[PDB]
Amino acid sequence: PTVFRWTGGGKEVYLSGSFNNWSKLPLTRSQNNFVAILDLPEGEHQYKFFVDGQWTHDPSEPIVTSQLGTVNNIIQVKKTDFEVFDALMVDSQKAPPILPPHLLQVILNKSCDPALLPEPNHVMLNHLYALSIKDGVMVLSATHRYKKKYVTTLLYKPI
Amino acid sequence: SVYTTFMKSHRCYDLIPTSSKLVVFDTSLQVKKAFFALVTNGVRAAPLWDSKKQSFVGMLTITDFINILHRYYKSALVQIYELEEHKIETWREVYLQDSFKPLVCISPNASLFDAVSSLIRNKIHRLPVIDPESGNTLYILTHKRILKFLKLFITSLEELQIGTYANIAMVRTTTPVYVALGIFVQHRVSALPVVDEKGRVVDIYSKFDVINLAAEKTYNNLDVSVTKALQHRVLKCYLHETLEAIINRLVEAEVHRLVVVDEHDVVKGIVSLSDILQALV
Amino acid sequence: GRVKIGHYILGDTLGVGTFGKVKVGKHELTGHKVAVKILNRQKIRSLDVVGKIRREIQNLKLFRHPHIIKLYQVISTPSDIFMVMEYVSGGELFDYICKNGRLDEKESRRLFQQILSGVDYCHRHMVVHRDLKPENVLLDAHMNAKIADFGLSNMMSDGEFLRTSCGSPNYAAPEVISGRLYAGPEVDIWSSGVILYALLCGTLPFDDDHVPTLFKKICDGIFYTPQYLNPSVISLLKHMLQVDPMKRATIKDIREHEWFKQDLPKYLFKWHLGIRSQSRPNDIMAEVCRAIKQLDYEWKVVNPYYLRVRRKNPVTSTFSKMSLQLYQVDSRTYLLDFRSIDDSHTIEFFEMCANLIKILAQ
Ligand SMILES: O=C(O[C@@H]1O[C@H](C(=O)O)[C@@H](O)[C@H](O)[C@H]1O)c1c[nH]c2cc(Cl)c(-c3ccc(C4(O)CCC4)cc3)cc12
Ligand SMILES: Nc1ncnc2c1ncn2[C@@H]1O[C@H](COP(=O)(O)OP(=O)(O)O)[C@@H](O)[C@H]1O
Numbered sequence A: 001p002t003v004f005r006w007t008g009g010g011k012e013v014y015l016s017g018s019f020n021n022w023s024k025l026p027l028t029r030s031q032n033n034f035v036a037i038l039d040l041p042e043g044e045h046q047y048k049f050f051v052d053g054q055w056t057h058d059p060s061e062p063i064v065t066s067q068l069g070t071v072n073n074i075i076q077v078k079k080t081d082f083e084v085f086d087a088l089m090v091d092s093q094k095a096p097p098i099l100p101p102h103l104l105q106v107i108l109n110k111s112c113d114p115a116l117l118p119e120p121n122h123v124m125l126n127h128l129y130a131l132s133i134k135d136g137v138m139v140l141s142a143t144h145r146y147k148k149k150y151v152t153t154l155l156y157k158p159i
Numbered sequence B: 001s002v003y004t005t006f007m008k009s010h011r012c013y014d015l016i017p018t019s020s021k022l023v024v025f026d027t028s029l030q031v032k033k034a035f036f037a038l039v040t041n042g043v044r045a046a047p048l049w050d051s052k053k054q055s056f057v058g059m060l061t062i063t064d065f066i067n068i069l070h071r072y073y074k075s076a077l078v079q080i081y082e083l084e085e086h087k088i089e090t091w092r093e094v095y096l097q098d099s100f101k102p103l104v105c106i107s108p109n110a111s112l113f114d115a116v117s118s119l120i121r122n123k124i125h126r127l128p129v130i131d132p133e134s135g136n137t138l139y140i141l142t143h144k145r146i147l148k149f150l151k152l153f154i155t156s157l158e159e160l161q162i163g164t165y166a167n168i169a170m171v172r173t174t175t176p177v178y179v180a181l182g183i184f185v186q187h188r189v190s191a192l193p194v195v196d197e198k199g200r201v202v203d204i205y206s207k208f209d210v211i212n213l214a215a216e217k218t219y220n221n222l223d224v225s226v227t228k229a230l231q232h233r234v235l236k237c238y239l240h241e242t243l244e245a246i247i248n249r250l251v252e253a254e255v256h257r258l259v260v261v262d263e264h265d266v267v268k269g270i271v272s273l274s275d276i277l278q279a280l281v
Numbered sequence C: 001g002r003v004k005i006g007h008y009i010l011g012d013t014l015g016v017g018t019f020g021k022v023k024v025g026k027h028e029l030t031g032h033k034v035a036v037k038i039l040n041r042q043k044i045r046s047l048d049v050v051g052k053i054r055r056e057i058q059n060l061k062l063f064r065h066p067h068i069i070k071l072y073q074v075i076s077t078p079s080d081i082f083m084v085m086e087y088v089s090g091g092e093l094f095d096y097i098c099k100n101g102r103l104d105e106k107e108s109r110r111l112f113q114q115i116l117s118g119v120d121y122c123h124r125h126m127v128v129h130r131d132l133k134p135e136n137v138l139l140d141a142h143m144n145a146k147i148a149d150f151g152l153s154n155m156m157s158d159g160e161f162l163r164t165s166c167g168s169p170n171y172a173a174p175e176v177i178s179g180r181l182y183a184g185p186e187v188d189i190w191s192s193g194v195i196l197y198a199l200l201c202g203t204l205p206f207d208d209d210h211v212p213t214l215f216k217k218i219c220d221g222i223f224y225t226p227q228y229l230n231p232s233v234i235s236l237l238k239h240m241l242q243v244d245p246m247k248r249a250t251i252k253d254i255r256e257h258e259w260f261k262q263d264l265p266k267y268l269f270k271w272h273l274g275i276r277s278q279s280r281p282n283d284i285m286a287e288v289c290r291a292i293k294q295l296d297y298e299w300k301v302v303n304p305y306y307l308r309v310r311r312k313n314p315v316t317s318t319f320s321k322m323s324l325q326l327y328q329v330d331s332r333t334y335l336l337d338f339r340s341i342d343d344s345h346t347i348e349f350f351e352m353c354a355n356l357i358k359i360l361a362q
């Protein structure tokens, strides 16, 4: 289905087009927009407007000038125009931020299983945390999510 | 077998917990610091990463501590200079020479049966679970966890004949830790029952009780008796008891193996978590 | 001469939303009514919201909660995009509260539970509808709440904060008016607390004609509790309207609160981060760039504080990515944060980070 909107005032406005054998079709006005919606076959269609006694075209829409000097708008209704995600894909063509307190809420410092740990806030996953280098050995750590479970891996690495 | 079919269906992942901790050691790490880190983190085994190899080469467990301790203890008067200043790889080079043993692992999507089989297949107690897209080690699958899972879903010992009952490795009250460690090395079994003046069992020194030496920094003295050692902190079963009720006993007390004993509390054999999951495979 | 989309005749303009007019649609035959959001392709590409809408549709097309407006279908045309949604007779909750006074403890509790359930659903789906207000809470013929404008909504991705300072300043969280970084749900809680106050009192907790004092009040988290207000709900509002997000009520803490729980229906429901240096931010970033190249690592400079760095593995011959970000901790110190970028991954990440640290400031 294709939308036909005439932006600008008028008492009576009609859409003549190759699709309706150039018959005068009346566009309903809401406010300053006069519209009609109609499905047209995946092809080339020419149209014009009968806006209050005058014949125009939308200057903003693509036109075609005839061998006889007839100026009409044109519309190439593409396959891509039909499907939402197909169309949306085709449509796509200082100071240091303050430290969010969230990145300080860890799950290691704060009877029970030492391997078992609390569930983390999504916001602290994949972030590198480390322990002070005591004895020329660095201790790095990070919580990562695999499926609906989480693993806080800590590497004992000499330097 | 009904149990065996249920394990063949369940994915390893289902047993991985909500949020776990994983300790990985770079092979270039001083092996003493390595054991000290197991104790501090509260872990019984950790995977090893060779940076030059860019892969997990193996697992560092308490057996490694037992092994070093025995291979290298000279006396209480000298330092185990070897342990004190040796890297994980420097020792892995020694421990495994012309005798080569690769890294055993499982996938989270791989079967629970496939995993239980892999443990007995390669004769191990710790199995690292690795996701193939990430290459990341996620969890370490243990017999205790798989059994607690099977027992969670479960809704005589003399008849079925399950466990090791002949030429059983055990120590006396007086036995020094070194001697006991030497046994853990030659026999290669998880725990050693402590026997009195009579064949009756008084206590049990486990591969586990060997970490307290690391923990308390007391490894420098292995002349100490097995009882002297166990002072920092008994469970028995009989041949006239059902397997369902015997499996129930092991998980309710969360013990790695039960002692098969007679009326006079004298040793008859042992039934490990190992043997149980095997008989159910 | 009836303007149709689907088989619905487009009627009156219900209102104007975040990204377009919303019109009624009465089915040709059945007479069924729908809410139709009209997104002109040329305008949604002018504001660079084309990606936003792509995501918004994706999410809402698979959501199905009784207190969130249903997205029936999205119809595309060469001209515009039509979002066919469920219509509700009741209209704005806002006007309800204008028309009638404040709601009674019982009535307010119901609608608060209804709203919060939906707010939860969203979050439980990594969606955080910012701009949550009585104006965006619609009512049906049976007085059931319906969450409506997901134009200001956003996604929650593991390891990232949101920045956009969305929605009406009365409902805006102090950190949002402050233009600070936030996780997401906390800012939906702060709004829901404002909604709760509006239900119980029929007025706003933070409101002034003088905009600077409206903001002072918000960041001072100070609001008046009328004498008719139940101490238990006052307690809930005190917890929900915390200036500190670290001290603010969670969807779980609300669920657990006794005022909430009452008559609630069944159907609903020594570590350090990075490295910290006291140098001038410009020096720090220069130092990181002079060290990153000193490791032969490929990178892309996003912000003058955000950096997307890649490394070629010398063994497995695999690319591994990580993101570096500088934040200001103290009024005197700053800290470089390391975030892992998903395509051993984790161990290679650590190695990547480690290398930098050994040649860097605290
Ligand atoms: O109104 C529109 O855009 C607006 O443009 C303004 C401007 O600058 O002109 C902005 O200020 C404003 O914010 C913006 O939304 C439209 C963009 N695409 C459309 C497609 C259709 Cl089909 C219709 C439509 C539907 C039903 C009726 C009826 O009411 C049904 C019978 C007539 C009438 C017209 C309208 C639009
Ligand atoms: N998955 C594995 N891959 C390779 N070697 C392993 C693996 N798991 C353990 N090992 C090795 O097997 C030996 C015995 O270990 P194990 O019985 O599993 O330890 P423990 O009973 O203390 O948990 C050790 O030398 C250890 O390094």
Ligand SMILES: Nc1ncnc2c1ncn2[C@@H]1O[C@H](COP(=O)(O)O)[C@@H](O)[C@H]1O
Pocket: B125, B163, B164, B167, B168, B169, B170, B188, B189, B190, B191, B192, B193, B257, B270, B271, B272, B273, B274, B275
């Ligand atoms: N003290 C022991 N003496 C002899 N065999 C044992 C002893 N403890 C365990 N086993 C056996 O050793 C094998 C491996 O078990 P485990 O190392 O105890 O998990 C099993 O066949 C056990 O029955």
Ligand SMILES: Nc1ncnc2c1ncn2[C@@H]1O[C@H](COP(=O)(O)O)[C@@H](O)[C@H]1O
Pocket: B190, B191, B204, B205, B206, B207, B208, B209, B233, B234, B235, B236, B255, B256, B257, B258, B259
């Ligand atoms: N049969 C048993 N009776 C009493 N304690 C046991 C028994 N088996 C193991 N333990 C203890 O269980 C602890 C952990 O050892 P392990 O079972 O190898 O993990 C140690 O303190 C052992 O002494």
Ligand SMILES: [Cl-]
Pocket: A006, A007, A008, A058, A059
């Ligand atoms: Cl026009």
Ligand SMILES: [Cl-]
Pocket: C014, C015, C016, C017
């Ligand atoms: Cl409006």
Ligand SMILES: [Cl-]
Pocket: none
């Ligand atoms: Cl009507």
Ligand SMILES: [Cl-]
Pocket: C087, C088, C089, C090, C140, C141, C142
């Ligand atoms: Cl209705």
Ligand SMILES: [Cl-]
Pocket: C094, C097, C098, C134, C198, C202, C203, C204
């Ligand atoms: Cl109000």
